[PDB]
């Protein structure tokens, strides 16, 4: 039966995300006062299978200045690591149940930038390099911020599980104790993700297409895959720590349909902020986190440790 | 107009209700009407081990009451 | 055992994909398609040469902040303690020192990108 | 299910090897995070999951921040994977035989204990409490912020005049 | 004539609610919300595309085509 | 756990041979250096995981701080030895025995 | 003082981050000091049983401890109830 | 019957390559003006399923969309052999198609199908967007008039 869960887990995350691609696709055609694709699907539905079995059926060109190894490595890298995210959270039950699942998260965050690391590095080129430059340079600012944000959250909450989470917000959200906790993580979202604003990983202007120019169809499609599922993955991780969906013992299923709805409301305003929004460079992002975000994100977390010692609010240890 | 993103929307509505609505059922199928019984410590873990001896059929989910007691 | 088998159900639906990526379309290579990119021109440069980046002092700076990162996240277990007083003494400490640092930091231009 | 512990220690023992052997240290890099996250399953495996992950994201930072050093001055117009001299790769399969007869060697000779090939994966865990709450890993490293606050004071005056020391040292 | 495109006319000085006003609109991200607006309005309008095989795009009879020799 | 130990001292000890053993790269060295770092983390988080010394461990955290600590003035060092030759070799830097 | 007030507002206008951090700062150092439920937060965590309360011996000498939970004496936990 | 299967398989792929085109962000002058009017919200490409992609990794079909000078020729080249195996060729205009305005030029390459195979030619100068569509769609229908599977199985 675990097996059975596994798929009902996997299939729908990969349906999920190539909507996603439709939905983003869409949704910024008609915010460029024009349509999205509408012609190969009934409403444009069967747009993502057609160019999955286009670019599943392309060569994949490896290249001849090439580290085949970790060409090859990155990709399957990056989607594994990508499933392995979506596996511990809770829609009320996560398949795996994990104490350290914020832990847990993190570290597969960071693998993920490794994945993207090891693919600029060894498809050797100018382009891929300068890619994987910016991503060393932006995980950097997000990786410190991410963790202290997520430091005083869970100060706030009480051990580093998601179920806890889920009893913490049963009775008001978390985006109104920490709200300024809520945009930093917002932001740091969009920096972990490499979306707009602040790609610059896979920068079309600035670079030709970044760590991805060398990659042909098979294995770049495999990096958009794992891309935009965890662009689905940090909207659900938000909604699940900040905007509590209602939970009752009785019912699980009204949970699961208020965190869809919160997690569609949040990949459509990240495809919101990709229409709005110019591109960043990529020293000013690390001088907006390290200037702006960590000092601030330094003060709140010290006021959070201050906070449930002085109203006796110390959350419980289970 | 904008309604035609509504068809693509109700898609991804559909495929993420189904993961966590699925898992919670399969808990239930596989836990005899009940919940998964997490065990975050090693309390809660030996209750579960105890259960599983206690049941006989070495399944924990298989509670057991004053009907044992004569 | 159960999270190994979902990793290894993920890793190995990853390799299925690359290999039917690899193994299903049709294949012609030749030395100008499999040439380095550039644009249209041919690399000047081997490509592996020095890059000379530009922030390795915030660099080592993010690898000491990822340690007071690390001596920070005990943190829930922490507040659970019996004297609270010595605890929120010491996390007022680090969290002032590690702003200290910061800031003498941003003083003396050290997160300014010198080229 | 029981030699898993072993079989973990004998990949990091292979993943140290590997960095010992030295390759261009983007590979060095690569090795040294194969080698963390095997560490880490071992601390898991063998308790309390805190030590394992605060080792392993320390080190994916601490190897990040190495892989752009090696982009930026560490590199060379053809870095060295391990095919570049066989002799890298004949010294890694010679200590790959090296530690399967030495640990033959050690099976073989049972009267220290050291290894045991029928009585591996039986001592894993020596004694645990059935029942508790709070006997975790984690539960010390909190006790770092009550009862060593020497320890604490150590580390952040240390990660402090670091940041002194390598503004002094790249100032340039 | 000319008019300036950047520069200001003297200053509006320090105070403490203009201060608060300016304060808001950097932690806030009033200008960032306002573009937000701006593109939702556009997400909500009707699109100018037409269903091009079938609806043609509008011409002149003054339109240079593909040449042709004629008759009497 | 007495096997398991075995192979950490045994790659704490294939670490300080690769210290010990230079190959032309600065940044080799530093590398093995955390790997004979990141064997005692281990050994140390299976001693006291093994012997239930919750009190002793802190000892990981402190010997992870201060390696990250000397990793970072190596660093800055291999910084400086670039900046100075522009190859960083070990057999590059050798002017001082005279 | 104007060159302090006239300062802190120009701070207000130009930089309202560290302005805000450093308010934020000092009000997490502030109101432990001043709060009356400071005390009550060690009182929870002293009064939270993660162990069993190991019984002692009745040398008949001790009249302060209980001889059941169901009596007066102990540390009633009523501050927490009506907490 | 193997044919049957092979030609609905063959129709299957050729579906896929013709509702996923992915043009190069490579045009050349005024005939990459009219192309980008082609992506303008008039005539939506991306609605036809048309979007660019800058790297020729990941492009499908390069629309020549300019003069092809002497000098930008061996660019060109480089760029359509750096391509993925299942590749066309749009040339657009004039100059594209034969020199055009600058056909007895020194330095222009007369015809982009002196350099690269073209597929589709399309007529003008510049071509309308309208006509530019016009030939994307005239390349959809020629690669579903493409029977591989029944070639290989009958070979
Ligand atoms: C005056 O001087 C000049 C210039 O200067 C100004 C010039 O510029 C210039 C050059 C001019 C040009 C080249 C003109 C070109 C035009 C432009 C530059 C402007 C047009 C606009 C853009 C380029 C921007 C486009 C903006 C957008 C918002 C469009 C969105 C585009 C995207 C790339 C993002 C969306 C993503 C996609 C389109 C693809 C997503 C889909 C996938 C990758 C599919 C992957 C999914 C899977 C693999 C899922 C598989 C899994 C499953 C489970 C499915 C199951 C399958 C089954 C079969 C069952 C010239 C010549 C010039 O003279
Ligand atoms: C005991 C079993 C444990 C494994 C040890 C034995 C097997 C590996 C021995 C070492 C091989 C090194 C080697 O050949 O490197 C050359 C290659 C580099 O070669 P390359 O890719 O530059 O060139 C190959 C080119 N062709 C294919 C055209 C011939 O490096 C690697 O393979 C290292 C990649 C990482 C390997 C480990 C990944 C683990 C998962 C990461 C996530
Ligand atoms: C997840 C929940 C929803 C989150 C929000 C999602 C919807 C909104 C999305 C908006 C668009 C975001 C796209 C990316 C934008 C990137 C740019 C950006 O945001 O830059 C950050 C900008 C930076 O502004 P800047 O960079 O222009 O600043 C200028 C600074 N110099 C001159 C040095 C360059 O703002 C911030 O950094 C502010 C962060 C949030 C601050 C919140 C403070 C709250 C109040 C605290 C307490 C106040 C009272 C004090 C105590 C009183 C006691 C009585
Ligand atoms: C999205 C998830 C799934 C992604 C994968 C896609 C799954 C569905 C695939 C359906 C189609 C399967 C066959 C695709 C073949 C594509 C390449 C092709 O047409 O090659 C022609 C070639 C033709 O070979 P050939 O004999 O003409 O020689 C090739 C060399 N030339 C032409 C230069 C002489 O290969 C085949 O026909 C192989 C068919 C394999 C069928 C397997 C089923
Ligand atoms: C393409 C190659 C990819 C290689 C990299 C793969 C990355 C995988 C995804 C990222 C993993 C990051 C590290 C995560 C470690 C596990 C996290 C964790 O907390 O595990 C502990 C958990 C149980 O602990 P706890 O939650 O406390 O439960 C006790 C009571 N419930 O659970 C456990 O104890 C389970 C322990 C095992 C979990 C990990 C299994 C990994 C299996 C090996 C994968 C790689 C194999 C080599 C490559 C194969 C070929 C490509
Ligand atoms: C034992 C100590 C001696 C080990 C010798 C290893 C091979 C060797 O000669 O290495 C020297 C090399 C020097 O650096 P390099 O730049 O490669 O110099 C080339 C020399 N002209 O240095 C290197 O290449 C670094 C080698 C590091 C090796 C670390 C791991 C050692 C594992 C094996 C231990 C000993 C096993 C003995 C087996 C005997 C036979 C059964
Ligand atoms: C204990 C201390 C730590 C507590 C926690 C807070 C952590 C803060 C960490 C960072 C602090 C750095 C302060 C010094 C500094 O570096 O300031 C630099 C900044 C000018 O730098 P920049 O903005 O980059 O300008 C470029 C050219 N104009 O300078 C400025 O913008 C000038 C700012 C002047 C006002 C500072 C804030 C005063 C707030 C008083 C609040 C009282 C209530
Ligand atoms: C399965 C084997 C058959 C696959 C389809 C073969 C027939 C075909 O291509 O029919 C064409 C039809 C409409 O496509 P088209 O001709 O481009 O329409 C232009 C209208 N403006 O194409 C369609 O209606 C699309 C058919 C898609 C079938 C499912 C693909 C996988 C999901
Ligand atoms: S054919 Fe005409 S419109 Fe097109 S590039 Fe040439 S001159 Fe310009």
Redesign the interface.
């Known amino acids: 039966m675990f097996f059975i869960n596994i798929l009902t887990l996997l299939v729908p995350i990969l349906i999920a995300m190539a909507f996603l691609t439709l939905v983003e696709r869409k949704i910024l055609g008609y915010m460029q006062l024009r349509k999205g694709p509408n012609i190969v699907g009934p409403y444009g539905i069967l747009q993502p299978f057609a160019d999955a079995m286009k670019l599943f059926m392309k060569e994949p060109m490896r290249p001849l200045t090439t580290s085949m190894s970790l060409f090859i490595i990155a990709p399957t890298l990056s989607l594994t690591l990508a499933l392995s995210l979506w596996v511990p959270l809770p829609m009320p039950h996560p398949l795996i149940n994990l104490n350290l699942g914020i832990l847990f998260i993190l570290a597969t965050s960071s693998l993920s930038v490794y994945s993207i690391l090891w693919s600029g590095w060894a498809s050797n080129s100018k382009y891929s390099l300068f890619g994987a430059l910016r991503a060393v340079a932006q995980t950097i600012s997000y990786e410190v911020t991410m963790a202290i944000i997520l430091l005083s959250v869970l100060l706030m909450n009480g051990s580093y599980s998601l179920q806890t989470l889920i009893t913490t917000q049963e009775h008001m959200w978390l985006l109104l104790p920490a709200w300024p906790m809520a945009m930093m993580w917002f932001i740091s979202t969009l920096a972990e993700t490499n979306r707009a604003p602040f790609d610059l990983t896979e920068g079309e202007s600035e670079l030709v297409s970044g760590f991805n120019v060398e990659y042909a169809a098979g294995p770049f499609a495999l990096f958009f895959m794992a891309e935009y599922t965890n662009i689905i993955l940090m909207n659900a991780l938000t909604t699940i720590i900040f905007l509590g969906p209602l939970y009752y013992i009785n019912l699980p299923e009204l949970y699961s349909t208020n965190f869809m709805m919160e997690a569609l409301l949040l990949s459509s305003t990240f495809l919101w902020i990709r229409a709005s929004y110019p591109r960043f460079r990529y020293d000013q992002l690390m001088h907006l986190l390290w200037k702006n975000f960590l000092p601030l994100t330094l003060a709140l977390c010290m006021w959070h440790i201050s906070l449930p010692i002085f109203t006796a609010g110390v959350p419980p240890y289970m | 107009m904008w309604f035609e993103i509504l068809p693509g929307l109700a898609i991804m509505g559909v495929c993420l209700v189904i993961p966590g609505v699925s898992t919670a059922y399969i808990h239930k199928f596989t836990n005899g009407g009940k919940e998964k019984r997490v065990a975050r410590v090693q309390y809660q873990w030996y209750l579960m081990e105890r259960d599983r001896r206690i049941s006989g059929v070495n399944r924990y989910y298989v509670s057991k009451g004053l009907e044992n007691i004569d | 055992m159960n999270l190994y088998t979902v990793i290894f159900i993920n890793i190995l639906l990853s390799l299925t994909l690359i290999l039917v990526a690899f193994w299903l379309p049709q294949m012609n290579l030749y030395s100008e398609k499999a040439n380095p990119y550039e644009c249209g021109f041919d690399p000047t440069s081997s490509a592996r040469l020095?890059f000379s980046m530009k922030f390795?002092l915030v660099?080592?700076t993010f690898?000491?902040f990822?340690?007071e990162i690390?001596?920070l996240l005990p943190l829930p277990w922490a507040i659970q303690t019996i004297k609270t007083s010595t605890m929120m003494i010491m996390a007022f400490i680090l969290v002032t020192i590690l702003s200290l640092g910061l800031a003498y930091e941003w003083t003396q231009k050290g997160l300014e990108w010198t080229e | 299910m029981n030699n898993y512990?072993?079989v973990?220690?004998?990949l990091?023992?292979v993943?140290?090897?590997g960095?010992?052997?030295?390759?261009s240290?983007i590979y060095?890099?690569l090795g040294?995070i194969v080698?963390?996250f095997v560490?880490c399953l071992?601390?898991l495996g063998?308790?309390?999951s805190f030590?394992?992950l605060?080792?392993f994201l320390?080190?994916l930072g601490?190897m990040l921040?190495?892989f752009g050093?090696?982009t930026?001055?560490?590199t060379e117009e053809y870095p060295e994977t391990w095919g570049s001299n066989w002799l890298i790769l004949g010294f890694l399969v010679l200590?790959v035989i090296m530690?399967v007869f030495l640990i033959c060697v050690?099976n073989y000779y049972d009267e220290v204990?050291?290894?045991?090939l029928d009585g591996?994966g039986d001592?894993?865990?020596?004694?645990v409490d059935d029942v508790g709450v709070m006997?975790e890993?984690?539960?010390?490293?909190a006790?770092?912020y009550s009862?060593?606050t020497w320890?604490?004071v150590?580390?952040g005056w240390?990660?402090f005049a670091?940041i002194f020391?390598?503004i002094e040292?790249?100032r340039? | 004539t000319y008019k300036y495109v950047n520069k200001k006319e003297q200053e509006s000085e320090v105070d403490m609610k203009s201060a608060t006003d300016n304060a808001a609109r950097i932690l806030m991200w009033t200008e960032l919300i306002r573009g937000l607006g701006m593109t939702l309005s556009y997400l909500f309008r009707e699109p100018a595309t037409i269903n091009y095989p079938f609806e043609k795009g509008p011409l002149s009879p003054r339109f240079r085509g593909e040449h042709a020799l004629r008759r009497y | 756990?007495?096997?398991?130990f075995?192979?950490?001292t045994?790659?704490?000890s294939?670490?300080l041979?690769?210290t010990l053993?230079f190959?032309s790269?600065?940044?080799?060295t530093?590398?093995?250096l955390?790997?004979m770092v990141?064997?005692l983390?281990?050994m140390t988080?299976?001693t006291?995981?093994?012997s239930?010394?919750?009190?002793?461990?802190?000892?990981?955290?402190?010997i992870?701080?201060?390696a990250?600590?000397e990793?970072?003035?190596g660093?800055?060092?291999?910084?400086?030895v670039?900046?100075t030759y522009?190859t960083?070799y070990v057999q590059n830097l050798n002017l001082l025995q005279c | 003082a104007g060159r302090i007030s006239a300062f802190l507002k120009n701070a207000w206008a130009k930089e309202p981050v560290l302005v805000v951090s450093f308010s934020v700062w000092g009000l997490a150092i502030i109101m432990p000091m001043i709060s009356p439920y400071t005390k009550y937060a060690s009182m929870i965590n002293k009064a939270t049983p993660y162990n069993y309360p190991v019984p002692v011996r009745d040398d008949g000498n001790m009249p302060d401890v209980p001889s059941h939970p169901q009596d007066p004496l102990g540390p009633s936990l009523d501050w927490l109830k009506n907490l | 019957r193997a044919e049957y299967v092979v030609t609905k398989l063959d129709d299957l792929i050729n579906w896929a390559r013709r509702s996923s085109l992915w043009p190069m962000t490579f045009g050349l002058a005024c005939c990459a003006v009219e192309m980008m009017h082609m992506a303008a919200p008039r005539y939506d490409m991306d609605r036809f399923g048309v979007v660019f992609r800058a790297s020729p990794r990941q492009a499908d079909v390069m629309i020549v969309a300019g003069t092809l000078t002497n000098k930008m020729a061996p660019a060109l080249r480089k760029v359509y052999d750096q391509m993925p195996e299942p590749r066309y060729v749009v040339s657009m205009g004039s100059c594209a198609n034969g020199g055009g305005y600058y056909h007895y030029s020194y330095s222009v390459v007369r015809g982009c199908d002196r350099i690269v195979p073209v597929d589709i030619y399309v007529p003008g100068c510049p071509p309308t967007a309208e006509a530019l569509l016009y030939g994307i769609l005239q390349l959809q229908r020629k690669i579903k008039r493409e029977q591989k599977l029944k070639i290989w199985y009958r070979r």
């Open positions: 020095p390795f660099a080592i690898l000491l990822d340690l690390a001596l | 512990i072993f973990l220690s004998s990091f023992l993943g140290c090897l960095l010992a052997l030295k390759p240290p060095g890099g040294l080698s963390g560490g071992m601390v063998f308790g309390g030590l394992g605060m080792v320390i080190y601490g921040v190495v050093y090696t930026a001055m560490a200590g530690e050690l204990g050291v290894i045991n591996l001592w894993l865990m020596y004694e006997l890993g984690g539960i010390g490293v006790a770092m009862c060593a320890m604490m150590v580390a240390s990660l670091g020391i390598i040292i790249t340039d | 756990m007495p096997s398991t075995f192979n950490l045994m790659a704490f294939l670490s041979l690769g053993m190959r790269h600065l940044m080799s530093l590398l093995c955390e790997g990141l064997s983390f281990i988080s299976v006291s995981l093994n239930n010394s919750m009190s002793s461990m802190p000892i990981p955290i402190t992870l701080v201060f990250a600590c990793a970072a003035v660093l800055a060092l291999l910084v400086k670039s900046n522009g960083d």
